[PDB]
RNA sequence: UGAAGACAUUGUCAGGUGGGGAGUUCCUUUAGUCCCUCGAAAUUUGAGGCUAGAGGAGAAAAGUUACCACAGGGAUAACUGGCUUGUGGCGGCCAAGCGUAGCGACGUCGCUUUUUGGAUGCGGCUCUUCCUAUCAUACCGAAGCAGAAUUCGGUAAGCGUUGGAUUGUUCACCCACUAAUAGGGAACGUGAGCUGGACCGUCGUGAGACAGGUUA
RNA sequence: GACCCUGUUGAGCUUGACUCUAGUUUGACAUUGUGAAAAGACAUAGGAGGUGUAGAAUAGGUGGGAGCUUCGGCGCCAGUG
């Protein structure tokens, strides 16, 4: 493994602040004098406890395949892409939320965009290109993405209309099987 | 073999539906985005998620083949065996990745019912077979076992 | 989190104010209900961590990984008013 | 018919038609003998007398 | 030949073996009768002579016939709920509302739920994709309830290929502690990592090391689980090749590796643990060379390990003796699980304390 | 001088890791002797070891892909036209021959395939003329074809060739009159008549949007 | 429609030397005492022991053994291992 560099952590925190509300909560120290850290193994970043990372160093580089929760990967062009594996953190501290009925929840898992015919609840005053985590009617985190229009435009929108751009969904777990 | 099978018996949505769902989710259809492969293929698992690299290749239900007619030369016999995996198509790496079955195509076939005794005293449970017909013209797959 | 903290407070706070706290929590259960029923039904206790009492932030203290066990003292508090208030709390929890 | 639906050329359609019509023929050639047996029994029943069970 | 005729002849031979003294022949003996039954069952059930003979020595006639009928019949569906996300009552309610037939697997596990028939694919349900339940087996449930892991401990899943056992460990440790999940094949570690990330586990370290370099790499784990690679004579339903692809050479190489693995686990645990010094050895086979002889080897080559009560609801005790070899008397504490008695995949479990 | 306390802290050897700092330019496979050790089961194995082939300037970045999205460049720009129709493909055996191993028709054997009886996702109506690959009518040949009702085949286009249910439409199946209630062409515009978008610009892009402009 | 190439991008694969080393981490040992109460393993001396299958039968195990004898019950012998 290797800790993130300053620019790499700047990029990762830019994306994380795009999708989440508070981040000092993530990097806050815990009761037992332990804290969460960020590490990179084979152009993947992993959110993991410092104790777990320090006990995972005994593993040789070629043999470490996972550690904690995989947030995403840094691409060859130097940009961070977030993952459905990083969805749980997003659910914990999400900024904007979008609830979808079953009729759109199943398509969202199949890998389709969210539609006004699917939306069942909004978050008031959501700007155009903002960070919204997609849940179902049972408050179960289903995915995350960036919304298409604002709340007013979505309300005025044709019900057969795109309201959210899909970026990651729980169906990729059915892929990596 | 057939009596053994008979006594043994005595003892998700399709990619077209998924594509229609994605289309209902997405307003604008890019021209020619739906790229259906018009060749017979083998898939295996009933429901799976494909990589975004290959999420544009649609393999139709009517063209999916799961079972083939394999001929053993040394013991001259033709038996119907299930296909395990498309191993190599000497025409296109894309074809062998999508599992396209063409003429002269190396595939893995289950020979469990045939009962081949090997050198180590094993029992054969998977062997290479070369598809030697044109499944695109003939609604069947004919292969010869490389044994 | 606030329900758990207010139950602990009402346990450790004088009689009339404790009666007020029990009334407020009864109103909270009336308004929300299904959201907080898990705090008293132990079969729905989440196991995604451990409760941190002396936390620093509301989200940091995992509220659904714990159970409100205080009743076992506030039913034997010396004041009939708080005792009947807790009785009303359980009554409406039951009539959820 | 499904394969013909997904056909892409006249040669493919011709081979698919030829295959379908020939596969049905092979089936009949398998059903040679039962047809002969049924013809024989048909003739014998057509020649059987009428015997009324309850008279 | 006529395998229905052979089924009838097997039934006749079984009754003859049951009542040889009363019902007999002029001079035909038990040896001839059991040899004919061996050939009969090898022919009809597609078992090679070696393995078929081995299982025939394993069980009394009636029980052997039941065992092989069970091995021909598949197991029901069973799922494990994530205590990290939901609980059994709500999960069952949601699945029934979605239209699948479930009911609790028994009174021995509070986290398991048996499924009979379904209208929606079980691995495509929104709760499954959200990580609410996992398609595991009850036999796989057993080893973790043998090794219940407490919170804030170091656990070593020495072979965690599927992932169900590691996720269940995480469930019982409440996403606390450190779990070293090792799997010696990248391809299957891919599915391991996928399952971990789907079920929402944050305390896993996935390694691709040979499971025998562990006292060298880390050492000193509080608890270890060792699901030893075996001959597979307990999942013959799922893997039909085992019926005729297991020979003497195999039953000599497999146990040597298992014995080395058990020694590695013993050396990897610590004797001075504040909460637990436990090794749990589990095996998917039902053969004595695969099962409890490695336990005897462990108790014979490491005196500082003691076999302890398994704490599992049901099962049959281990075999103190077999055809010639006598084991340690304490081996009776171990438990054996077979399909014909209990509708579960055939396993063996063993729990050990480290003292030195 | 007080408090804490046999736990810490601390030290040493053995290792694991090392994408950070300083300096310089090991495992896996193959074959062999049954040569040694190490494990394991007892009447044998697995792992190291020996010999020599094959795998793995250097934290800056690099190579690669019949894949993906966007942008661009190039070639092709319609198309079949003595085409089409009734008999499947694969492998073995036989096989006059050609040949002097290779190609090889018809048949046969094996798979499909057997010991008990909805598909479809532009349609519909009227009239002229032509074809026959004939539904009826005329005449024939064959059939356990007694009679009757028929079935198959042949010459025959002279003469005629409906209505329902259902479905977005059509066919299949089913139901009613009838002698029967056949199939097609009018030639890339299915004879005549009637009826039921692409370019630019802004902002984006893990994504599209514009009562922004122009235009056939 | 389709096909080939280039640029950027995504997805994936491969490579990115060696020796010490900070950091990190595992095991053992040591300071280092006085006692008391518990547990384990070493010392004897005893006492008691074994139910997979079948075999009448709860077969530690090995060694000899065709005869053993509170002189009537046993062995061997036939099994079944």
Swiss-Prot record, chain D:
Location of the protein in the cell: Nucleus, Nucleolus
Family, per entry: Belongs to the TRAFAC class OBG-HflX-like GTPase superfamily. OBG GTPase family. NOG subfamily.
Biological role stated in the UniProt entry: Involved in the biogenesis of the 60S ribosomal subunit.
Protein name: Nucleolar GTP-binding protein 1
UniProt source species: Chaetomium thermophilum (strain DSM 1495 / CBS 144.50 / IMI 039719)
Coverage span on the entire protein: 112 to 166 of 661
